[PDB]
Amino acid sequence: DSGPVVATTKLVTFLQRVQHTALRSYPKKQTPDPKSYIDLSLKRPYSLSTIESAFDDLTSPVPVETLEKFVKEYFDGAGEDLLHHEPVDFVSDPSGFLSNVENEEVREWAREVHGLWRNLSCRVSDSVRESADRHTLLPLPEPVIIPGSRFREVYYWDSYWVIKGLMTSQMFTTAKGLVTNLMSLVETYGYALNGARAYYTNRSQPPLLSSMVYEIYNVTKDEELVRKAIPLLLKEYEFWNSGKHKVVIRDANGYDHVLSRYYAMWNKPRPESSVFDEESASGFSTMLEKQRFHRDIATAAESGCAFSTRWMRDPPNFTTMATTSVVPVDLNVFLLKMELDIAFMMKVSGDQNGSDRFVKASKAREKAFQTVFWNEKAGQWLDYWLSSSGEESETWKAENQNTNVFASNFAPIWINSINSDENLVKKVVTALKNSGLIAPAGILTSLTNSGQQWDSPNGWAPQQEMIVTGLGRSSVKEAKEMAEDIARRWIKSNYLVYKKSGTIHEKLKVTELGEYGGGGEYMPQTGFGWSNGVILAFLEEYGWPSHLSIEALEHHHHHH
Ligand SMILES: OC[C@H]1O[C@H](O[C@H]2O[C@H](CO)[C@@H](O)[C@H](O)[C@H]2O)[C@H](O)[C@@H](O)[C@@H]1O
Secondary structure, X not given: OOOOOOOOOHHHHHHXXXXXHHHHHOOOXXXXXXXXXXXXXXXXXXXXXXXXXXXXHHHOOOOHHHHHHHHHXXXXXXXXXXXXXXXXXXXXXXXXXOOOEOOHHHXXXXXXXXXXXXXXXXXXXXXXXXXXXXXXXXXXXXXXXXXXXXXXXXXXXXXXXXXXXXXXXXXXXXXXXXXXXXXXXXXXXXXXXXXXXXXXXXXXXOOOHHHHXXXXXXHHOOHHHHHHHHHHHHXXXXXXXXXXXXXXXXXXXXXXXXXXXXXXXXXXXXXXXXXXHHHHHOOOOOHHHHHXXXXXXXXXXXXXXXXXXXXXXXXXXXXXXXXXXXXXXXXXXXXHHHHHHHHHHHHHHOOHHHHHHHHHHHHHHHHHHHHHHEEOOOOEEOOEEOOOOOOOOEEOOHHHEOOOOEHHHHHHHHOHHXXXXXXXXXXXXXXXXXXXXXXXXXXXXXXXXXXXXXXXXXXXXXXXHHHHHHHHHOOOHHHHHHHHHHHHHHHHHHHHHHHHHOOOEOOEXXXXXXXXXXXXXXXXXXXXXXXXXXXXXXXXXXXXXXXXXXXXXXXXXXXX
């Protein structure tokens, strides 16, 4: 690759060696999660040089008993450097919490979901700050909310929907803390990392930071937060609008549309999945093909949706991942959101000429959505696949739109200039109604059952929320009806799942009421940050009447 690469740490490189040994030692019916080995930290007082030398003696297939003894002796385990934290603003039953939820069974369930913020609340241990080089966990200034289970660290875009839920939970200090943490990542690296781990320094994630700041500010009117956030949001904005992230698509009327793609600064196996990734690339002839494929994999991770037919050139063929060729609808929704957020914030802070720069920017991206992304026949917005490398501008071609149907195709409904357009909303409602994405438990993320997790039969919390929120803001009766119907489907199914398992799941199998989803490279995970956040946010928006059942026995097609 001629393209840019952010180096990793010697620790991460070493821990991949441990990972490879482990995935070879265990029987195929007991293979562990590879991520757990890159989350280890070095047990004092031994240096990395000492532990690597001892690992070399050990490996010079290691039996499972010998390997576990080695790992127990030289490492503190995964997550041991991430400490439980009692959130200062947590209250077991906040006054006025979900007062519009009059179904007492539902409100008590939501209180239990609210209670899970304590489980997800952590603080990076002091050991990390005093000797950061011994941990892959990154130091952070404030306590975090994590997604849960194997996601032993704060993630970027999950934090938005977590924050939406924290605001229902009346936890505005914890919410600001998340923003403070991500702001410190932008300060250090120039972008917000995929997550607060050493092996994520090479990529970002969908740019939700401005939206987090906006949603908090809209409640607390925290002017200091906005003032602190503006220069960091400007850094983030230039990051997405320069270098390999920026592409130019020229339309038939002569307008150059400046848009973004994902682009991880990495061209190797992801350390956290190093064994899986080396295997999946084993079939490529040249090193250059492998490096291109690895960049496309790590870019699909940067998309927040690893993995999906959405990023494959010949779906469902995983080896055809091609994420750096995709100008994605949802990424550019978030960048439109950033331009609107930053214009609002500079108006608030009293920078009128700055606010005009981003009004001009948002109108220009609004033009790009009408020309580059919209597809009138489909009634939705389509990812745009590049013909070339993205170095130089290219001319828009209708055949380069991905006509496959995804929940992300409806992401622009989240933007107020779109959901304010009655005629457009009507077309989108019809397209969503007729797409096949609306399933018993919510909105399918795609229509292809690939075995990947960001595909049918799964639906995902962030994707439900953006469509429900956007549709619910239009003045169109059919849209507000559709949003509430989807929100109650999603709530109900998550409750039915919880009634069985006592846990909230990462993703739902939305083709069936009350089933969680799976697929992909790791087992279904529970917690779960954005899933808790959307459950609570939907309940605050819609409530739940006392006489409306949440149980599976009743299946009304009429609402109350
Ligand atoms: O398996 C390694 C990958 O894990 C992550 O993908 C997850 O991270 C999400 C969103 O930010 C989770 O909350 C979500 O449910 C997963 O899809 C990570 O983001 C990737 O970088 C890792 O390669």
